[PDB]
Amino acid sequence: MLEDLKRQVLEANLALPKHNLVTLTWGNVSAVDRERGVFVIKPSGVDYSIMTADDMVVVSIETGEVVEGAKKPSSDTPTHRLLYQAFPSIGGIVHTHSRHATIWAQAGQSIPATGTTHADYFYGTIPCTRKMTDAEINGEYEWETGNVIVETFEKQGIDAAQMPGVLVHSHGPFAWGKNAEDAVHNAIVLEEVAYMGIFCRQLAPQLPDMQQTLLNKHYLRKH
Amino acid sequence: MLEDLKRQVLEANLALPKHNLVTLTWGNVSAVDRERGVFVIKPSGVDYSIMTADDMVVVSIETGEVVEGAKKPSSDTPTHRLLYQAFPSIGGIVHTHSRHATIWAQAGQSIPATGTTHADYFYGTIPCTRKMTDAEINGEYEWETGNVIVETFEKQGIDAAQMPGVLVHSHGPFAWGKNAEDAVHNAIVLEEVAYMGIFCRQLAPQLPDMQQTLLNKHYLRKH
Amino acid sequence: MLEDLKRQVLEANLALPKHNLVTLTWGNVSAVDRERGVFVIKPSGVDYSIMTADDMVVVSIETGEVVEGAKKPSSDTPTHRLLYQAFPSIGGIVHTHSRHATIWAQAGQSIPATGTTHADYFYGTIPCTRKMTDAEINGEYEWETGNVIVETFEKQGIDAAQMPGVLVHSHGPFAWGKNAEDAVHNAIVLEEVAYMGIFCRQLAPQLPDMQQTLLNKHYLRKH
Amino acid sequence: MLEDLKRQVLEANLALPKHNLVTLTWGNVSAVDRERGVFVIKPSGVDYSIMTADDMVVVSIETGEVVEGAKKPSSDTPTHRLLYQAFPSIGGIVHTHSRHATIWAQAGQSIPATGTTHADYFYGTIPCTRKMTDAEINGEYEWETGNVIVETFEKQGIDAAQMPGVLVHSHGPFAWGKNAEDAVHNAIVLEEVAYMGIFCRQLAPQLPDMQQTLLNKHYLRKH
Ligand SMILES: [Zn+2]
Ligand SMILES: [Zn+2]
Ligand SMILES: [Zn+2]
Ligand SMILES: [Zn+2]
Structure with missing residues (x-):
């Protein structure tokens, strides 16, 4: 019912392993169609090497119910849905366990902006959420994961349109963008600055965050 | 005599270099057939690029004697055999010297669970054995290596069915699973969490193990 | 108007992703033609996989105006131009955000010469510039970036012909050389010594710079 | 005059970039023919992608003079020659600047044996030479490099036949073996243990060298 969107989401998902952002079947990409009040997301239980545009699943933004698709949607669907509802500006969402971004996530630390590479895509510190409560973990987990992300941005006063990523x-x-492709790009850059962030810290443990002026020059220039 | 099993084991072995879990001729995979009381394992002295299903060797679980095969079985056969005998649930075993898992092994340290990536495949700390005694090293080495692994799980009260790996x-x-393929997957994830475990420690040297609730949510969800 | 130069610059740019010095559309290479008082540089907004020799842009060294080309020149053109004007000896310039060289750059530290690999291409410490002032960042940024580089070499008395790189x-x-190809080679070696520089420091935090005699033997031997 | 040897050496050299032990034109492999009192080595100034068996150069062990070949031999020829003369057992020599082995070399530290991977190929600590004197550096450099290696093994009482490598x-x-191929294998393993050696140290800074019994079990088993 949204063949072109399914194509985009299919290609985006296929891009994950190509850019070494994932292994096995981890990761998932989705793109939204606000007017139709629905979003297309990777299916659960399908290898990237067999995946076809037909395998993509169409889900209702409002009910989270599957509108079209023979396969089961990604188990992360609720998190995606919540995010589309909470952040009006986003058009695509990417979730991966890319090694270095995940390393920061497991360390429970935020990735500070120390380079223009980072400044070009994320307006400031890429936030890491607080730990989830047992109530949240044992409740509607994926949906609750989405809430913790939204809470992180709200309590810290950060605009989802200027920070297309979170740990x-x-x-x-978790990354997002104007569309499936754009989200994938932010996901790869997120991994990139995560990687460089680890070692530049090692070289300079007391390195201060980059100059606000330089951050502004770069982020505001684009966007 | 077990053509399909030989095919599976052949493909599993071939997967080792594809996933960069090994170099040269290191590594070996085997799969069992409980009913026939036998297991198929990679041959010793054969490059992965020349290996064929016929090269796989069939070995008796009870006697460790070669039941069928023109080639010599992997020198690690005894360890595999011991493990099949000790852990009834396992159907496949993988041994590699994958860089990062091996780094932890050489450091003689256990890989703590600090991420859901890990939680999805290993229910808790991936154990590292104690050093082997000179008696053990100079006796039936490979077989003794198997005993040290079993002893590790017993003295620490860890269920081999919930911890498909050991250092x-x-x-x-050494990893294992329901079958050859499943063991290979656990082997690759083991390498993955080993890698991330190194650097998340560097970022947060005092990082506590992940929340028990989160570990439970993830491991118990699957399995 | 300089078909062969465009070919060289096209190939040099295409070499960037091949040698993993860049991702997405980052990076850019240019080569000069002193006699014609012009230089050819990568275009802005074109994927490496679609790029053709026609896409290359010809720019005036003196006015920085586009002499020929249907596409917009790289946003880094001013930095390139400034460098060609300031350093007469250079014939090619390469700019990338290659992970490890960039890690040193974000750490704001210079890469010391600790190996003959380095000695063969850079005569001494590869300099890192001071931070740019707000005036510089908010003025003619790219052009000013070029000035900061030149100032670095002048105040430190380093010959651009013996140090084909800077952070x-x-x-x-930013790297340079006799031509497009030569600059690309220096760029890849720069990344290489940046990588090794990180870990040899970790192994030996108090490691002194390599022997001046060894540095001289290697650099002076070539060049 | 030694077509088969030239083929072997050609393939060995070509293996260097395939195993990511080198970049650009760094590295070189040679194999000897004791009876003919000559050795074949990679040529100087030839890309790996253009190299043919004819490009290999034949050099006299006794005089270091080129016996056959249209191209100039590798600038490292003297070091190779010296080594063949000093160590009768070796039949092949490999020199590379493989990232991690080189990191240890630049740090001027020896790689301790902390794993069976290492034990299978190097009987003990892989030695790193002392710094070379100015007299040595400014004299017959490459030849002198060879002398420093031999001196290292002699003063430390290490048998070149049990330690096919040195930093x-x-x-x-610098690595060596029974032949070109064997030397290449030792070179790749040397890089491997160099890599793991860096991070296992990070995980366990006070980690003691592996058990002598385990080292013996593994090295003596083979060889
Ligand atoms: Zn996830
Ligand atoms: Zn082993
Ligand atoms: Zn840049
Ligand atoms: Zn060298």
């Missing part, structure tokens, strides 16, 4: 404590990264 | 002090990782 | 604080590496 | 302070690794 979920002890879990991994 | 042998100063040597390398 | 721009919080940004990334 | 030259501030330079890089």
Whole structure:
């Protein structure tokens, strides 16, 4: 019912292993169609090497119910849905356990902006959420994961439109963008600055965050 | 005599270099057939690029004697055999010297669970064995290596069915699963969490193990 | 108007992703033609996988105006131009955000010469610039970036002909050479010594710079 | 005049980039023919992608003079020659600047045996030479590099037949074996244990060298 969207989401998902952001069947990408009040997401239980546009699943933003698709949607669907509802500006969402972004997530630390590479895509510190409560973990887990992300941005006054990424404590990264492709790009850059962030810290443990002026020059220039 | 099993084991072995879990001729995979009281394992002295299903060797679980095969079985056969005998639930075993899991093994330290990636495959700390005694090293080495692994799980009260992996002090990782393929997957994830475990420790040297609730949510959800 | 030069610059740019010096669309290479008072540089907004020799842009060294080309030149053109004007000897320039060189840049530290690998291409410490002032960042940024590089070499008395590389604080590496190809080679070696520099420091935090005699033997031997 | 040897040496050299032991034109492999009193080595100034068996150069062990070949021999020829003369048992030599072995070399530290991976190929600590004197550096450099290696093994009482590798302070690794292929294998394993050696140290800074019994079990088993 949204063949082109399914194609985009299919290609985005296929891009995950190509850019070494994932292994086995981890990761998932989705793209939204606000007008139709629905979003397309990777299916659960399908290898990337067999995946076809038909395997993509269409889900209702409002009810989280599957509108079209023979396969079961990704188990992360609730988190995606919550995010689309909470952040109006986003059009695509990417979830992976890319090694270095995940390393920061497991360490429960935020990735500070120390380079223009980072400044070009994330306006400031890429936030890491607080740990989830037992109530949250044992309740509607995936949906609750989404709430913890939204809470992180709200309590810290950060605009989801200027920070297309977040690290979920002890879990991994979540990125988003204008569309499926854009989200994938932010996901790869997120992994990139996560990697460089580890070693530049090692070289300079007391390195201060980059100059606000430089951060502004780069982020505001684009966007 | 077990053509399909030989095919599975052949493919599993071939997967080792594809996933960069090994170099040269290191590593070996085997799968069991309880009813026939036998297991199929990689041959010793054969490059992965020349290996064929016929090269796989069939070995008796009870006697450790070669039941069928023109080639010599992997020198690690005794360890595999011991493990099949000791852990009834396992159907496949993988041994590699994958860089990061091996780094932990040489450091003689256990990989703590600090992420959901880990929680999805290993129910808790991936154990590292104690050093082997000179008696053990100079006796039936490979067989004794198997005993040290079993002893590790017993003295620490860990269920082999919930912890499909172990690190042998100063040597390398050993993984297992329901079958050849499943064992290979656990082997690759083991390497993965080993890698992330190194750097998340660097970022947070005092990082506590992940929340028991989160560990439970993830491991118990599957399995 | 300089088909062969465009070919060289096209190939050089295409080499960036091949040698894993870049991702997405980052990076850019240019080569000069002193006699014609012009230089050819990568275009802005074109994927490496679609790039053709026609996409290359010809720019005036003196006016920085586009002499030929349907596409917009790289946003880094001003930095390139400034460098060609300031350093007469250079014939090619490469800019990338290659992970390890960039790690040093974000750490704001210079890469010391600790190996003959380094000695063969850089005569001494590969300099990292000071931070740029707000005036510089908010003025003609790219052009000013070039000035900060030149100032670095002048105040430190380093000959651009013996040090084909520099790290721009919080940004990334810039390399150059006799031509497009030569610059690319220096860029890859720069990344290489940046990588080894990180870990040899970890192994030996108090390691002194390599023997001046060894540095001289290697650099002076070639060049 | 030794077509088969030239083929072997050609393939060995070509293996260097395949196993990521080198970049650009670094590295070189040679194999000897004691009876003919000559050795075949990679040529200087030829890309790996263009190299053919004819490009290999034949050199006299006794005079170091080129016996056959249109191209100039590797600038490292003297070091190779010296080594063949000093160590009768070796039949092949490999020199590379493989990242991790080179990291140890630049740090001027020896790689301790902490794993069976290492034990299978190197009987003990892989030695790193002392720094070379100015007299040595400014004299017959390459030949002198060979002398420093031999001196290292002699003063430390280490048998070249049991330690197919060495690190030259501030330079890089040198490996050898029964033949070209065997030397290449030792070179790749040397890089491997160098890599793991870096991080297992990070995990366990006070980790003692592996048990002598385990080292013996593994090295003596083979060889
Ligand atoms: Zn996840
Ligand atoms: Zn082993
Ligand atoms: Zn840049
Ligand atoms: Zn060298």
